Amino acid sequence: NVSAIYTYGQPVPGSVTIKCCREASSYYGRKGNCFKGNRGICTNITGELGPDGAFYGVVSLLPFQMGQSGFQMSLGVALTVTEEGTGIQVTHQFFIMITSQLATLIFDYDALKEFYKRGIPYLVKVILTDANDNPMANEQVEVELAGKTIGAVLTDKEGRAEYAIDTSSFVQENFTVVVSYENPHQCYYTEWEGPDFPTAQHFVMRFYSETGSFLDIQGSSVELNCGQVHNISVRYILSLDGMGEGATTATFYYLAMSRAKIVQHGQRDVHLNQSKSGLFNIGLNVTS
Amino acid sequence: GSYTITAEGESCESARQGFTVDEYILPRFSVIVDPPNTISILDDILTLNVSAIYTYGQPVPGSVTIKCCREASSYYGRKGNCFKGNRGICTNITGELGPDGAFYGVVSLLPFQMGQSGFQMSLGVALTVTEEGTGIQVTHQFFI
Amino acid sequence: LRNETNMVIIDIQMLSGYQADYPSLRQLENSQQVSKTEEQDNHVFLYLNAVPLKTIQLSFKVLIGSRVLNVKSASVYVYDYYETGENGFASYSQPC
Amino acid sequence: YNYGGFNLEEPEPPCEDPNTVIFCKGRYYLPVSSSTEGDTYQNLRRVGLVLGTSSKIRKPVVCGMEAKFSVPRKSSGESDFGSSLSNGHVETLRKN
Numbered sequence: 001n002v003s004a005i006y007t008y009g010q011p012v013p014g015s016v017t018i019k020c021c022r023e024a025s026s027y028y029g030r031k032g033n034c035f036k037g038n039r040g041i042c043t044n045i046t047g048e049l050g051p052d053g054a055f056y057g058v059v060s061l062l063p064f065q066m067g068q069s070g071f072q073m074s075l076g077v078a079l080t081v082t083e084e085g086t087g088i089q090v091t092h093q094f095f096i097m098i099t100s101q102l103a104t105l106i107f108d109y110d111a112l113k114e115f116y117k118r119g120i121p122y123l124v125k126v127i128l129t130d131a132n133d134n135p136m137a138n139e140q141v142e143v144e145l146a147g148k149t150i151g152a153v154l155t156d157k158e159g160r161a162e163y164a165i166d167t168s169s170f171v172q173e174n175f176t177v178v179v180s181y182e183n184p185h186q187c188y189y190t191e192w193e194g195p196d197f198p199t200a201q202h203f204v205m206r207f208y209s210e211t212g213s214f215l216d217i218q219g220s221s222v223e224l225n226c227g228q229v230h231n232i233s234v235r236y237i238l239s240l241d242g243m244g245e246g247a248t249t250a251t252f253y254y255l256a257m258s259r260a261k262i263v264q265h266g267q268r269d270v271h272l273n274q275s276k277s278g279l280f281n282i283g284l285n286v287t288s
Numbered sequence: 289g290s291y292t293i294t295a296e297g298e299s300c301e302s303a304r305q306g307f308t309v310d311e312y313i314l315p316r317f318s319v320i321v322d323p324p325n326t327i328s329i330l331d332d333i334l335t336l337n338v339s340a341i342y343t344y345g346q347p348v349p350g351s352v353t354i355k356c357c358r359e360a361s362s363y364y365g366r367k368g369n370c371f372k373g374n375r376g377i378c379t380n381i382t383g384e385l386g387p388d389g390a391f392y393g394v395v396s397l398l399p400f401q402m403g404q405s406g407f408q409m410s411l412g413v414a415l416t417v418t419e420e421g422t423g424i425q426v427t428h429q430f431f432i
Numbered sequence: 433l434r435n436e437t438n439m440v441i442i443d444i445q446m447l448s449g450y451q452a453d454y455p456s457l458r459q460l461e462n463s464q465q466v467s468k469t470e471e472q473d474n475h476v477f478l479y480l481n482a483v484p485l486k487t488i489q490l491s492f493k494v495l496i497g498s499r500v501l502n503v504k505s506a507s508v509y510v511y512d513y514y515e516t517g518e519n520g521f522a523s524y525s526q527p528c
Numbered sequence: 529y530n531y532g533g534f535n536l537e538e539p540e541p542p543c544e545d546p547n548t549v550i551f552c553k554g555r556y557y558l559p560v561s562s563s564t565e566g567d568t569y570q571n572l573r574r575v576g577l578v579l580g581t582s583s584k585i586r587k588p589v590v591c592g593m594e595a596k597f598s599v600p601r602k603s604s605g606e607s608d609f610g611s612s613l614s615n616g617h618v619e620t621l622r623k624n
Contacts, residue, residue, distance in 0.1 A: 007622070036403050067365050067373045069405035101368045109606065115566045173562055189365030189373070196369045207566040208587045257575070316500055416499070423528065425499040427449070 003054045004081055004090070013050030014083040018057055019043065020096075024070030037070050067189075073098045100191045103130040105141065105159070105181055105198050110221050115207040116175070117214035119168035120237055124151075126179055126200065128159035135159055142180045151179065176203040212239045226288050231281035238276050248272045254282065317342045319417060319426045327411070327432050329403050334395035340417055340426070347389025350418035353382045356395060360406035376406070437512035438482045445506040446474035447526060449498025456493045463490070483512075501528055529573055536578075544590035559590040563597060 004012045024037025041064055047055050065071075074097040082089045105128040116122055124143060128136040135158030143151025143163050155161045165177075178201035190196055207214075218233035236252070243250060254266030264287075270280060292306040319340035327334070334356075341347050357378030365373050379399065383391040401407070415428035452471070461469055465488065468479035478490075505526065511519035529536045550557055567587040572579065579585070 071366070100366055103368075184371065186371065187367060188369045188371060189367035190369045191366035198368070205565060210584065210587075257577075260576075422501075423503075424501045427497070427499040 001054075001056055002079065003049075005053055011050065011053040012081075012083065013048070013053075014081055015046055015048060016055050016057070016079065016081045017044065017046040018059070018080075019045075019078045020059070020075050021064075022072050022074070022076050025072065041065060041070065071098070073100065099131060100189075101198075102186055102188050103128055103136065103181070103198060105161075105179065105200055107200060107202055108221070111219045112202065113216070113219075114202075114204050116167060116204055117207055117209070117216070117237075118170055118212065120214050120216065120235065121164040122167050122204075123162055123164055124177070124179070124202075125160065125162045128155065128161070128181070128198075139181070139183070142182060143177070144180060145175070145177050149180075170206075173206070174203065175206075176201050178202070211241050213237055213242050224286055226286060229283055229285040231283050233279060233281050235279040236277060238272065240276070252280070256284075316424065316426055317348060318345075319415075319428065321415070321428065323413070323430065323432060325430075325432050331397060334397055336391065336393050336395065338391055338415070339389065341389065347386060348417070349386035349389075349420060351382065351384040351386075351416070352391050352418075353380075353416040354395075355380065355414040355416075356411060358400070358408060358411045361408045363406075433483055433485050436518065437514050439513045440480045440483045440510060441513060442476075442478045442480070442508055442510040444476035444478070444508045446476070447504055447506045448501050450494055450496040452476070452492050452494050460490065460492055501526075529576065529578075541586065541588075543594075544588060546590055546592045561587075561590050561593055563589075563593055563595050564600075 002016070006012055019042065021040045021042030023040045025033075026037060027033035043059070043063065045057065045059065047057060049055050074095040076093065076095050078091070078093045080089050080091045105126050108125045108127060111123065111125050126141070128139065128141070130136065136155060138154050138157055139159075140152060140154050141161055142149045143153065143165065145165070150165065151161075151163050153161050153163050178199055181198040183197070188197075214237045216235050218235075220232070224230060234252075238250065249269060249271045251267055251269045254268065255262065256264045256266075264284070266282070266284070268280060268282070270278070272278065289309060290306065291309045292304055294302055294304050296302045317340065319338075321338045323336075338352065359376035359378075362372055364370055377400075381395065383393050385391045411432045413428075413430050413432060415426075417425050457469055457471070460466060465480045465482060465484075466478070467481045468477075470477035470479070503526070505523050507521065507523040509519060509521055544559060546559060548559065565587065567585065569586045572585075
């Protein structure tokens, strides 16, 4: 969807001719690959503009070879535009890369804390897209801890899968989990001797607690604007053998620092109405 | 069915002359080939030399519709995993002989790709031998 | 159909030299009514669960064993097992 | 904490023996620990605050499996700031 314009915003009628092609593979010659492939299957097109300056050059690829050995994974694109009176010609060359991996799924390196705690579920959020970074419709992916598939989760219509993995009864030490997309249907074709389907592993470490009672804060992918008090979230487990049973209320303590300065202290006292755990929202009043 | 004579001797060694028993009517004339069977990528055109004659040792009149072709392969490609792509190619050609009785002839190898990645490294061949009155033929299939 | 039989068998005669193929065979077996298949010395037996009052259509590829030929037409004979008397004849010319 | 050639880190507490055998309820047990783990002591010393409460914060580490492991310093922050800050993008001036 190309156009052009004069020095001061004036339409530029003329002939636009386009060539886009590439060599097949050209390995080595001699004891390598003497006569192999061709000089490159190549086309030549032309079009006219003039209303105000515009050309919508749709091009067929069927004559070109999709899925064969004449590949170099990028199409060299050449455009030359001329003018009726002045045979002057304006040229622009560039490469358009021919992709291999349709869809990819990735960890969110804003969430995904690396240090984990027993009994408090670990959340895993992974983002899937295709080609030109599009949201992925409802698809099913799989979460496998060591070799066992546990996730089998459908997405949220735009590739933002989140999963709550149990953490109770784990004394494990390495715990490299990995995630997978298994589907025998997509136009996907093993290329660089890699995974036979999309995969992504995170290696995480246990955090230490002598008695066991765990705390975490909900991360945010967005900035917090000035002067807007919010209710940022915290979750907590208190095991028995902590404060001492019978006192069903604990004080949690709160701190901020801007550059090197202890700022805006806080404290919240909370009743453990249920057995041992819960979560809280922190009403922090942000300031410039 | 299968029937067999078994015979034991003095020292209990036994011969088993087996054989089939299936009623049948003796058939056809003689056909002879001798394909090179080994073909390089830098080969231009497939020369040929195939003969055949009657049961009596004299040439027979007819034609030879030779079939020779090859698909590419399973061919998983390069986009991330599995799930193979598209289909392949074949052809149809013919030959004739009988006056002296010889096709010899050749096969245009050029239409078939050369040195590409669309191969399974061997070529299939299937013969044919016609007669005027008797449309009876003799079977011959192999690979190169 | 009513109160006569609930099982059927078709046999098919080969000719000259030619055969069907086992891939075609087990492709076919994954079809309705196909209780049993059999290939025997140019005689194809197909033992089918029951009979429809409607048309049931089956087809199969045929290779060529020995390409000696003769201008003859082969036949298929269908019947039932309870009483074998009720049966049907048909034939078919060679595709050559 | 190591700022301007000033360490400010207090020394580690004594280590534990690798052979003391303790039984609690079932089987009979020996110490073991991993160097690569996390404590509130490493939770801090990443921001820079300091506390001195008499309570434990440092994880007890038995001998034989101490820190070693060279110096595990990866990106540790995912920086995006820099210099130059210009690619080619040749759009020469087109306006008065």
